[PDB]
Amino acid sequence: IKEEHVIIQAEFYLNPDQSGEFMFDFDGDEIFHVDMAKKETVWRLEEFGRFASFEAQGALANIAVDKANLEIMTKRSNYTPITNVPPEVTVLTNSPVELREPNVLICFIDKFTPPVVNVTWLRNGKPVTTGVSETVFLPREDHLFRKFHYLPFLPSTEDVYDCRVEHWGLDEPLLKHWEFDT
Amino acid sequence: DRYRLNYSLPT
Amino acid sequence: DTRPRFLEQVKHECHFFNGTERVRFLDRYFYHQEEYVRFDSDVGEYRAVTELGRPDAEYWNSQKDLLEQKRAAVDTYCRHNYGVGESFTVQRRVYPEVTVYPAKTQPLQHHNLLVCSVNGFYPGSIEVRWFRNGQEEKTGVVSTGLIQNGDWTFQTLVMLETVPRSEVYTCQVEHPSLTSPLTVEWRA
Ligand SMILES: *[C@@H]1O[C@H](CO)[C@@H](O)[C@H](O)[C@H]1NC(C)=O
Ligand SMILES: *[C@@H]1O[C@H](CO)[C@@H](O)[C@H](O)[C@H]1NC(C)=O
């Protein structure tokens, strides 16, 4: 079927946020990343960590080199900054919607940079943090980024949901709407 | 098994 | 906080063809979105991609122990890592879940919208087709294209403009996890 496969070790460092990322990517899906604060390998699916292992220490050293290299690249460019590129946002569910049957809202955040975004789920205009999760920033072949936010929920005709996305490249915070019929 | 890292080179 | 941002990216890439028979290793370095220097294993040394990368290409190319490490990356790094995860990446195959249902939002007159929801499959390569009592439907077919859920599953939604009456519509799905086409029939 697919003759080609690509494994990508992708890294970034962002100033002045001092945000770094290290992750392995197979055919566009994350195998693992290294949590900067916790110095831990975080497997995208826990099963991956049962079959394979990875020493996070080397990844963190890479990030420090990328930070050093970044400061040099910054001077070399006469302090040329990154152009904000606003994301495109899509909201969908993981499976077909059914009343009172657990589902998951996915907020797909695509084609943006720098890799800094503020996402908030709203249920009936009220923020919801119960059970939310998210991925790290995934690399794109145009070297922008992609990100997923998830919200488990019980579908009902009573509730409406929004994915509030804030990004420097946007003018107003972006709200993507989802109802039972969407 | 173990994943290997590839080194990012300092300039 | 509208402070100006500065981003460095590095992508160490391993490209595989026919398992591990053919491998290309790339060591790519980016300022913002701009790739400025690159090691291509087919080339054997670092080459600047823009003017911003001339210093790095010369500097790293002057270190023989450095080039000799990157030239063995196709074996020590790419081929090794391929074997580490082969069982749960290259060989990961998850059935598609196929559901057929009329769209909860029926927006057009005379024609109704029939949905073939294909969910939770891996890998991403898939072919979804619509048949009307044995005839392939190439008119009134709308598809979302492939959608990555970000959790190692994919989904796609393929909608048919049907003529609602009594007639049998078949969604047929072909996918590398299957040894036979998956068909779901809908009789109105
Ligand atoms: C993100 O936005 C929320 C409001 O929706 C705010 O309370 C929070 O402080 C923001 N965080 C960042 C990092 O911008
Ligand atoms: C693929 O690899 C196998 C095993 O090494 C080899 O026998 C076969 O000839 C290769 N096929 C192609 C098309 O390269």
Residue numbers in the entry:
A (entry chain A): 1 to 182
B (entry chain C): 1013 to 1023
C (entry chain B): 2 to 167, 169 to 190
Quote what the paper states about this structure.
CD4+ T cell autoreactivity against citrullinated (cit) self-epitopes presented by HLA-DRB1 is associated with rheumatoid arthritis (RA) pathogenesis. Here, we examined TNC1014,1016cit peptide, which contains citrullination at position P-1 and P2, to study the underlying TCR-HLA-DRB1∗04:01-TNC1014,1016cit molecular interactions. The TRAV35+/TRBV10-2+ PB TCR was previously isolated from peripheral blood mononuclear cells (PBMC) of patient with RA.
To understand the register of TNC1014,1016cit peptide (1013DcitYcitLNYSLPTG1024) presented by the HLA-DRB1∗04:01 molecule, we solved the crystal structure of HLA-DRB1∗04:01 presenting TNC1014,1016cit (1013DcitYcitLNYSLPTG1024 KK, where two lysine residues were added at the C-terminus to improve the peptide solubility) at 2.4 Å resolution. The TNC1014,1016cit peptide bound to HLA-DRB1∗04:01 in a canonical conformation, spanning from the N-terminus P-2 to C-terminus P9 residue of the peptide binding cleft, with a well-defined electron density map. In this HLA-DRB1∗04:01TNC1014,1016cit structure, both citrullines at positions P-1 and P2 were protruding away from the binding cleft, indicating that the presence of citrulline at such positions did not impact HLA-DRB1∗04:01 binding. This finding was supported by the similar relative binding strength reported for native and single/multiple citrullinated TNC1013-24 peptide bound to HLA-DRB1∗04:01 (EC50 ∼0.6–1 μM). Moreover, solvent-exposed residues of the TNC1014,1016cit epitope, including P5-Tyr and P8-Pro, might also play a role in interacting with the TCR. The electrostatic profile of HLA-DRB1∗04:01TNC1014,1016cit binary complex revealed a distinct neutral charged feature at P-1 and P2 of citrullinated TNC1014,1016cit peptide as opposed to its native form (positive charged arginine in both position), likely suggesting the preference of the overall surface charge of the contacting TCR CDR loops which would affect the TCR specificity. The sequence alignment of these SE+ HLA-DRB1 allomorphs at the peptide binding cleft revealed high sequence identity of the anchoring residues at the P1, P4, P6, and P9 pockets for HLA-DRB1∗04:05, ∗01:01, and ∗14:02 alleles, consistent with established MHC II binding motif.
